[PDB]
Amino acid sequence: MATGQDRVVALVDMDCFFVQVEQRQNPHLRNKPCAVVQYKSWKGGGIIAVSYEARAFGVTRSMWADDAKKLCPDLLLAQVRESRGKANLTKYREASVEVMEIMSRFAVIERASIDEAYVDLTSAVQERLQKLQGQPISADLLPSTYIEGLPQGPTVQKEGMRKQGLFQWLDSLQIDNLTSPDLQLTVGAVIVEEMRAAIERETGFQCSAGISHNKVLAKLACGLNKPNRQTLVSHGSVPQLFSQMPIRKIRSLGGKLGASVIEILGIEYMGELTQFTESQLQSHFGEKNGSWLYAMCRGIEHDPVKPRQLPKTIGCSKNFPGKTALATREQVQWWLLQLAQELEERLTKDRNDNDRVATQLVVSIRVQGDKRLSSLRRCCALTRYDAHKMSHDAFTVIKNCNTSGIQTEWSPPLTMLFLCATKFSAS
Template structure:
């Protein structure tokens, strides 16, 4: 909704406009703020800027180091902010959430990949607290084994929350995900999947073989 439309609907609204330079929005303030956040995140891993207010952070090495030197082996010793994580696949009982999250984060018999995710969740929680303390900015985050999944869930719970995607929850996450929500499928290709194959969700897409998709869209795209 444009500003003039908003004023017609709500005459008392106060609109805030970004600074303008040379007839265009001046985003230097936001870039500077983003740089402050990235500087903190980069203390734990390699950062890749995705947009003015989004960044991918590779925590693989930091998570491996934590798992080797100081693994989360006691529910009582878990960093408090990490216990507020939203972990896909855990029971939805709100009254037991913190207890369940603590147990998941220090599960001693989990596979190696989930242990790395648990360490990653703790590190991200620590970083988010640092960002808040040092810049007064809040952050939401997605923690997963790849950028695509992390991006998908980073905005699932807001504001100032984080979501973890264990490997066992990936299929359920994608099964009902609208195809247009998937990166690179939001444009013409996504529309083609809907029109040509009747695909509405990623779960629908998984019912087609690679050969069928290559036959329809070519070897590279399929």
């Protein structure tokens, strides 16, 4: 049987990233219930990032800041920079590149979102083991590490138990077996302590991190002791960890597919999947998903961490909901121009920084009365980083979905507009 202990993978995840980005810049928000918001007027603005101090009051993402203040009257607020009538995120993107560059010193990273990356440390863990000759690993090398499932067997303060668990782990490590997977997880955990130290001292940002054998475990582990902590999930921890883990908490099972794992099969927790055969799971979810599910519930995944530190697409979008929808040709032309303009800005910066040019532009629009995020999506060529050409071209390739017989109106009204650069080529 193949064990899934072949690689060492980590998932680093910035803590309340936007909140942190504003908190480094405005010291007045430090160590304070605090949230980041976009578009100030409707209900104070929508909250997309919450200080941990603020979360103790109930404040969550996707809350109207006015409601947020009903839970947390001293909630402090930063607002996302607006430009061209639109939210602009350049500060967090640039903040992100700060972090990704420091991470890259240690291994190749797969940028996963603006604020989290997977790491393959399999080989860096190798090298460290040789240089370790054979000497053990003192717990002083893992000041923020938690070992999931420990302590076991025969202190009530949160970090007090963290030390006893970390002691049990080390106390049973076969330091001499260079091929021992648990040993390599330990060595990985040591590296990311360093990696995390370097991020904090060189940017001021704190994050969390999971260390395990694939990306799904690393991601689930990283959540286990947020914030400013890092968790090691061993192959051995999985049966217990998964015995009560709701299926929806495993990455890619949060949506409809995980919903049908529950009702079809009639279970609640990841561990309950081991009683099914692969052919059984393939019967229900296709041959890729059953294969993926039969392994995953035993803690096995092979989705590699790809070498990809830059986004694969540069994209701009704005919604125009309610009666703010767009019912005029000139109105439609003006927001495309705005969007194309930010696009042109960001594109030019890309071409200079990463020696690459986008060759294909995707324009997409939603109409009031539809209910899927995209009503429509059609592509067109992108030959010049020129805001006027692109906005012109984007029109042409959507003009004909104006149902209204009169020229200067747009029926039905547009409630979403989207420009996106893609199909990159080295430059």
